[PDB]
Amino acid sequence: DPILLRPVDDLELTVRSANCLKAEAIHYIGDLVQRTEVELLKTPNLGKKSLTEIKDVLASRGLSLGMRLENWP
């Protein structure tokens, strides 16, 4: 899926969520959807509203969370 390997900037995140995501060593949207919800919840400064926005925008873009990904990279 070509949309998975795009940079995480294409999601139009806010300053807080994008800075936290870059501080958690993730640079691919496929990596972001690969991680489970609890793993992103445990990371510091990632609360309910930012994760809710991420879930909503991923669902609106056709993606989701916790999808099993093979052959990465």
Add this chain to the structure above:
Amino acid sequence: FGIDMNTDYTLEEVGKQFDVTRERIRQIEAKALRKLRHPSRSEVLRSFL
């Protein structure tokens, strides 16, 4: 920028329009410029250069 109207204004001349200070409008404009550089709102614009 004088879009769909007459003469464009400077930072101070639009300060009286909104009562905001000159510096904040320079930052208000700067953030407006910052939003449009992002993808998904700049793909078609890049075809004009």
